[PDB]
Design a protein around this ligand. Structure first.
Ligand SMILES: CCCCCCCCCCCCCCC(=O)OC[C@H](COP(=O)(O)OCCN)OC(=O)CCCCCCCCCCCCCC
Ligand SMILES: CCCCCCCCCCCCCCC(=O)OC[C@H](COP(=O)(O)OCCN)OC(=O)CCCCCCCCCCCCCC
Ligand SMILES: CCCCCCCCCCCCCCC(=O)OC[C@H](COP(=O)(O)OCCN)OC(=O)CCCCCCCCCCCCCC
Ligand SMILES: CCCCCCCCCCCCCCC(=O)OC[C@H](COP(=O)(O)OCCN)OC(=O)CCCCCCCCCCCCCC
Ligand SMILES: CC(C)CCC[C@@H](C)[C@H]1CC[C@H]2[C@@H]3CC=C4C[C@@H](OC(=O)CCC(=O)O)CC[C@]4(C)[C@H]3CC[C@]12C
Ligand SMILES: CC(C)CCC[C@@H](C)[C@H]1CC[C@H]2[C@@H]3CC=C4C[C@@H](OC(=O)CCC(=O)O)CC[C@]4(C)[C@H]3CC[C@]12C
Ligand SMILES: CC(C)CCC[C@@H](C)[C@H]1CC[C@H]2[C@@H]3CC=C4C[C@@H](OC(=O)CCC(=O)O)CC[C@]4(C)[C@H]3CC[C@]12C
Ligand SMILES: CC(C)CCC[C@@H](C)[C@H]1CC[C@H]2[C@@H]3CC=C4C[C@@H](OC(=O)CCC(=O)O)CC[C@]4(C)[C@H]3CC[C@]12C
Ligand SMILES: CCCCCCCCCCCCCCCCCCOC[C@@H](O)COP(=O)(O)OCC[N+](C)(C)C
Ligand SMILES: C[C@@H](NC(=O)Cc1ccc(C2CC2)cc1)c1ccc(OCC(F)(F)F)cn1
Ligand SMILES: CC(=O)N[C@@H]1[C@@H](O)[C@H](O)[C@@H](CO)O[C@H]1O
Ligand SMILES: CC(=O)N[C@@H]1[C@@H](O)[C@H](O)[C@@H](CO)O[C@H]1O
Ligand SMILES: [Ca+2]
Length: 1056
């Protein structure tokens, strides 16, 4: 019965039959239970439960009263409760949700999955230290947010009560709201605050009703049907968790910048660093560390000749585009006819030399044979085979040993990854059917729905990639309840911060197992670099003041022009003195013998050319524009002057070498999928744009209806457009909307139809899975190389003293503070007055209790001894700060009111420093923080290179996108009043958003859109520089952040 192993196979057979039974559920076709298909299914489910109950009885009898065994016991108990409770209509369907745990049974039946889960479950206990840090991040930022912005997102511009009453008119809506409605609320800034958005910014009517919305008072709803707000701690954590995932965090920021203050970006800049970057990357480091702790034919020319033929053929296949000329299509076919013949000529020649058996011996020779038959078949059969012509690129593996070796390493990576991927699909499946039960046809139908298995799986995969996952969250919260946020918190946490970090650990552990003399003296002088470095810094301020809105006649323009001449002369002399002392190139130690010296050569040379062009009253405007762009690279001279920056930059360029092949393999897949995407989707990404297009089906109908026939910014018309669309997909920002266009595509001059070709999911989801696999191997290749580089390198007083030295006092304080944390979290918007008095009294008790501790501490140790320890100093500061806070509150209560109410609010917010005391108790967390501290010297410079990169691109963006404008005639999808390149300060903040990858694809769209005919000073070739601007910044910015994660990882490994 149980002894025979075949019984386990019988159980595994039933398990799979239960998973298919769960997947056939239809949310609101089975709830009624009026169909015959459901009746057979529920009977099938009942039969399966009988088997499980029968088996469990047998096992219990055989074995009596193994964690997995307990789990199976839990499922049987839960199922019996659901099964036996039938006949009671009270929450019967709700109890039905417990069956989604049945697929978990398969973990124990598969030995490989059981081992991995066991290893995973033995790694969790040491993640607690990172969990304690998460509590601090959420509690600290969740109580400060509530204190500042409680109820400020309910603000709306209302009509004056007297106006409506006296004038006896009630046709207008009570408060201003765009025609879009509550989906885009117009939040105003209260009169006592200084928010950016005021009720006087309301656009006029388009005699004017809008101008009378001139009162900003609290409304009756928060943004997104109440989902986004800071009215209490519960609603604040939903916002904070959304910021930590870097999805929609700008929208939350803009909501408080428009209502409270523009300087609220500090609150979100810190949170993206402390929480989104370090806290989410400390979890990765901990898991990885813990896992580690647990005759003619053979001629060279012939091979080169055949290699060249394949390469030229591949280049030819990528020259197709929409509206292709007939002649170019004919030429391509002839070229295909010749090339396939050439391979066939090679196919015959090798056969003769080695014979039919000899040729079959070589494995590559076998593959070539499979390609010739289909190639000739296509000509003889004179379109599906056309898509197979891309396989010819695989022939090049024969003649690239370096890549051939690299591919083998990647292929051998699948043996270890196979067990995990099987664990991913089970994790996704359980949450796919769990989503159906909760959100089954409640989203009234949105494309992101849980209405069926196919589109519930896609909505769970999409959430894990964190693309529009908040849009799904808002619908889920509104439909069922605000507590539906727990579904997304668990899916995003167990999926992205535990399972994904486990995959990285699997990979890492797998791999891991006379005047000239004066110049000679002056340049060699110690302070020469610091003197020049000062001039360069002043040159950065001049660059940072440049912006489009400078009046040419103003004094500031004159000042900027003069300073430019001064710096150009200064750096010419510095270059001139160096060359004289060292010689241009003839000497062995010549000036141009080092790349850094060469770098300074081009920058100076451009400056002289700039002077000449400025000297020239001629048609040289185009040249003057290019020069203006290159003059933003001047800050690059800081690297050669700072020894720390020079070292790290040379290190980063070193880290690229080990992963060079993977980049080449990754660049090869971009072209192959780009060429494939062009063939499938060229000419089909057009749509009819208009208020109502339900009747439109073709281009002509779009013209007849006087609607516009337009094109998507990201399409696959040609390999140039395909590569720009694929990079956006790989970045996983806006990748969903490109997928929708692929599914909806119908044909040339045809209106796309929703979900026309669902089979296209394979093209897009396959690309994301493959590209994410290569990106993982770039991170591992950097780590493995770094590890290699690292391994090679009085009686009344005595009792008081006993109490203070005893742990009792410390644990008592930790209890008092833990109570304080609870009370501080009880505050919310419009709390009852009785609560205000109760919380005020609770503050009094804490204040005196802290005071007593300081009094006892002073007596036990003495005034000089007590002040020695920094922890005691922190107590003194907070107790002193607490006394100031409470003092001003009472004066505010008193008749005298000289205290500005900003002071009171700031003091209340700052009283959260009491939590820092718990830091002393958390020895584990402090050691974890100590790891980052020890790595600061290696991370501090990478932060200097990060800000230097930001400066060069923030100054470059202003020159490029300085003048772009947003208007109802030329609307912008990513830019707004908050995201602009108007000046250096704003471009710096926009680039910070781009680094996080929050709707950076929308910003790029706004630069690719054509300038208006009437508008002037629009760069013709901007749509070509914009993709280069965003691609390079995105890749360069992320590489620096990757190395900062690795630097902390190495330090952690070497400390344990
Ligand atoms: C340390 C935090 C780390 C994780 C944080 C992730 C985000 C947590 C979000 C999950 C909780 C979801 C509930 C959100 C909420 O406050 O709304 C519930 C409720 C409103 O929903 P009704 O359907 O009842 O609508 C009533 C309308 N009249 O809000 C309330 O009215 C009060 C709810 C209790 C206040 C929150 C205290 C508990 C903290 C949040 C729970 C999550 C814990 C996360 C660890
Ligand atoms: C692994 C995941 C673990 C967490 C489970 C995630 C899902 C939690 C439950 C979310 C939905 C529960 C409510 C279902 C429902 O339909 O509730 C109805 C009721 C009123 O809203 P209407 O949908 O009727 O309104 C539609 C408007 N036309 O919802 C509530 O407000 C009830 C909330 C009760 C909370 C029950 C679950 C959490 C209990 C506390 C957990 C701590
Ligand atoms: C100077 C060197 C320039 C070349 C550097 C090449 C390597 C760039 C690595 C970029 C990278 O790692 O990006 C990852 C990031 C997504 O990060 P997750 O969300 O997975 O991690 C968060 C949780 N820890 O990617 C992006 O956002 C943009 C890059 C997408 C990949 C593009 C690969 C193209 C290769 C050519
Ligand atoms: C790389 C080499 C090629 C491998 C992929 C071969 C795909 C073959 C495409 C055939 C085709 O044109 O149809 C594919 C089909 C679209 O259906 P219709 O053509 O009937 O649409 C209406 C016609 N106007 O959709 C698919 O099945 C696409 C699958 C693409 C493969 C993605 C995974 C590649 C690994
Ligand atoms: C990268 C390797 C593997 C293959 C080489 C790729 C090229 C063949 C691609 C890259 C850029 C592509 C071009 C990008 C833009 C255009 C313009 C497009 O429209 C025009 O001819 C514009 C006419 C006008 O401006 O009036 C026609 C296709 C073409 C030449 C594309 C044809 C295919 C090109 C040359
Ligand atoms: C190390 C480098 C980056 C030098 C330090 C940075 C400064 C050069 C930047 C940061 C703050 C910037 C300022 C932020 C805000 C403004 C207001 C803004 O004013 C306008 O454009 C006009 C506004 C109006 O007319 O209402 C743009 C210029 C200025 C002074 C910016 C000029 C450039 C500043 C001084
Ligand atoms: C291989 C992976 C990592 C991507 C590499 C970066 C690409 C996304 C960049 C590199 C060069 C870019 C191309 C440079 C120039 C053009 C031509 C441009 O067409 C025009 O010239 C239209 C504007 C005009 O009217 O001048 C359209 C975008 C495109 C194909 C760019 C699309 C984005 C490209 C392919
Ligand atoms: C560590 C903490 C999270 C545990 C203890 C927290 C509770 C004591 C606090 C947290 C926030 C408070 C809630 C914040 C907001 C509301 C809504 C308020 O009005 C409503 O019920 C309407 C809700 C709406 O319209 O949005 C009633 C009090 C209540 C439940 C508060 C009661 C006390 C709560 C649950
Ligand atoms: C990582 C490091 C941080 C990255 C981003 C930091 C950004 C810092 C400055 C980013 C923005 O601060 C500069 C502002 O002065 C912008 O100037 P504006 O013209 O918008 O108006 C100035 C006047 N108000 C609007 C302020 C009242
Ligand atoms: C999205 C995420 N990427 C990273 O963390 C760096 C990283 C990339 C890739 C891997 C491995 C698994 C493949 C591991 C780590 C981020 C970016 C930018 C940001 O903000 C920037 C700042 F605000 F600091 F300027 C916060 N998180
Ligand atoms: C035309 C109009 O609306 N006037 C009102 C005015 O009566 C009111 O006193 C003021 C302050 O609320 O706001 C405005
Ligand atoms: C659903 C609907 O509006 N029906 C219209 C029909 O009245 C009209 O004659 C036809 C041609 O324009 O297009 C469609
Ligand atoms: Ca996004």
């Amino acid at each position: 019965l149980v002894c025979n192993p075949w019984f386990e196979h019988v159980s595994m057979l039933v398990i799979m039959l239960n998973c298919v039974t769960l997947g056939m559920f239809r949310p609101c076709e089975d709830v009624e239970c009026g169909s015959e298909r459901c009746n057979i299914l529920e009977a099938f489910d009942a039969f399966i439960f009988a088997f499980f109950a029968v088996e469990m009885v047998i096992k219990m009898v055989a074995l009596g009263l193994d964690t997995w065994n307990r789990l199976d016991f839990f499922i049987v108990v839960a199922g019996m409760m659901e099964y036996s409770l039938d006949g009671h209509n009270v929450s019967l369907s709700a109890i039905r949700t417990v069956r989604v745990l049945r697929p978990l049974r398969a973990i124990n039946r598969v030995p490989s999955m059981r081992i991995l889960v066991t290893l995973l479950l033995d790694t969790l206990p040491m993640l607690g230290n990172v969990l304690l840090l998460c509590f601090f991040v959420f509690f600290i930022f969740g109580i400060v947010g509530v204190q500042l912005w409680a109820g400020l997102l309910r603000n709306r511009c209302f009509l004056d009560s007297a106006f409506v009453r006296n004038n006896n008119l009630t046709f207008l809506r009570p408060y201003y709201q765009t025609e879009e409605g509550e989906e885009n609320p117009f939040i105003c800034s209260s009169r006592r605050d200084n928010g950016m958005q005021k009720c006087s910014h309301i656009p006029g009517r388009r005699i004017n009703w809008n101008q009378y919305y001139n009162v900003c008072r609290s409304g009756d709803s928060n943004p997104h049907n109440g989902a986004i707000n800071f009215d209490n701690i519960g609603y604040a954590w939903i916002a904070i968790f959304q910021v930590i995932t870097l999805e929609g965090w700008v929208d939350i920021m803009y909501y408080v910048m428009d209502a409270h203050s523009f300087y609220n970006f500090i609150y979100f800049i810190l949170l993206i660093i402390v929480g989104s970057f370090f806290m989410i990357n400390l979890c990765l480091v901990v898991i990885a560390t813990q896992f580690s702790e647990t005759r003619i034919v053979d001629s060279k020319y012939f091979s080169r000749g055949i290699m060249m033929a394949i390469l030229v053929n591949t280049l030819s296949m990528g020259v197709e585009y929409h509206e292709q000329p007939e002649e170019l299509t004919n030429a391509l076919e002839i070229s295909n006819i010749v090339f396939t013949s050439m391979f066939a000529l090679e196919m015959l020649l090798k056969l003769l030399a080695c014979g039919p058996l000899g040729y079959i011996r070589n494995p590559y020779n076998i593959f070539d044979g499979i390609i010739v038959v289909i190639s000739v078949w296509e000509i003889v059969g004179q379109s599906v085979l056309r898509t197979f012509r891309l396989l010819r690129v695989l022939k090049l593996v024969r003649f690239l040993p370096a890549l051939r070796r690299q591919l083998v390493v990647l292929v051998k990576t699948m043996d270890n990854v196979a067990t995990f991927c099987t664990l991913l699909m089970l994790f996704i499946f359980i949450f796919s059917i769990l989503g159906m039960h909760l959100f089954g046809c409640k989203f009234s139908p949105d494309r992101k729905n849980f209405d069926s298995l196919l589109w519930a799986i896609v909505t769970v995969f999409q959430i894990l990639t964190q693309e529009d996952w908040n849009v799904v969250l808002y619908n889920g919260m509104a439909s069922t309840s605000s507590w539906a946020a727990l579904y997304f918190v668990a899916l995003m946490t167990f999926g992205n911060y535990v399972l994904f970090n486990l995959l990285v650990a699997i990979l890492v552990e797998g791999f891991q197992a006379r005047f000239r003399v004066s110049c000679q003296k002056v340049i060699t002088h110690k302070m020469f670099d610091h003197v020049v470095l000062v001039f360069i810094f002043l040159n950065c301020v001049t660059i940072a003041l440049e912006r489009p809105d400078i009046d040419p006649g103003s004094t500031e323009r004159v000042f900027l022009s003069v300073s430019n001449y001064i710096f150009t002369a200064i750096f010419v002399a510095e270059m001139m003195v160096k060359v004289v002392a060292l010689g241009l190139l003839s000497g062995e130690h010549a000036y141009l013998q080092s790349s850094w010296n060469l770098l300074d050569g081009l920058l100076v040379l451009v400056s002289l050319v700039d002077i000449v062009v400025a000297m020239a009253g001629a048609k040289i405007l185009g040249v003057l524009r290019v020069l203006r762009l290159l003059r933003t690279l001047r800050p690059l001279r800081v690297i050669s002057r700072a020894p720390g920056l020079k070292l790290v930059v040379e290190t980063l360029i070193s880290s690229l070498r080990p992963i060079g092949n993977i980049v080449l393999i990754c660049c090869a897949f971009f072209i192959i999928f780009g060429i494939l995407g062009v063939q499938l989707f060229k000419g089909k990404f057009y749509y009819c744009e208009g208020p109502d297009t339900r009747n439109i089906s073709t281009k002509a109908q779009c013209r007849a209806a006087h609607y516009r026939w337009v094109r998507r910014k990201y399409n696959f018309d040609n390999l140039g457009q395909a590569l720009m669309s694929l990079f956006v997909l790989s970045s996983k920002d806006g990748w969903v909307n490109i997928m929708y266009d692929g599914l909806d595509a119908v044909g040339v001059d045809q209106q796309p139809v929703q979900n026309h070709n669902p089979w296209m999911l394979l093209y897009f989801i396959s690309f994301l899975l493959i590209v994410s696999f290569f990106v993982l191997n770039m991170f591992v290749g950097v780590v493995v190389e770094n590890f290699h580089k690292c391994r090679q390198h009085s009686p009344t007083r005595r009792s008081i003293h006993s109490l203070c030295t005893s742990h009792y006092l410390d644990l008592f304080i930790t209890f008092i503070i833990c109570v304080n944390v609870i009370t501080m979290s009880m505050e919310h918007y419009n709390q009852p007055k009785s609560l205000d008095e109760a919380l005020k009294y609770c503050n009094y008790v804490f204040t005196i209790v802290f005071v007593f501790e300081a009094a006892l501490k002073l007596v036990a140790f003495g005034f000089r001894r007590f002040f020695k320890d920094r922890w005691n100093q922190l107590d003194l500061a907070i107790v002193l700060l607490s006394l100031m806070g409470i003092t001003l509150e009472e004066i505010e209560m008193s008749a005298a009111l000289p205290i500005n109410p900003t002071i009171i609010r700031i003091m209340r917010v700052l009283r959260i420093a009491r939590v820092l005391k718990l830091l002393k108790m958390a020895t584990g967390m402090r050691a974890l923080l100590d790891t980052v501290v020890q790595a600061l010297p290696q991370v501090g410079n990478l932060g200097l290179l990060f800000m230097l990169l930001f400066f060069i691109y923030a100054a470059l963006g202003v020159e490029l996108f300085g003048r772009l404008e947003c208007s109802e005639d030329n609307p912008c999808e990513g830019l707004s009043r908050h995201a602009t390149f108007s000046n250096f300060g704003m471009a710096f903040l926009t680039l910070f958003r781009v680094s996080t990858g929050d709707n950076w694809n929308g910003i790029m769209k706004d630069t690719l859109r054509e300038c208006s005919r009437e508008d002037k000073h629009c760069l013709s070739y901007l749509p070509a520089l914009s993709p280069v601007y965003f691609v390079t910044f995105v890749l360069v910015a992320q590489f620096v952040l990757v190395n900062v994660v690795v630097a902390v990882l190495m330090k952690h490994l070497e400390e344990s």
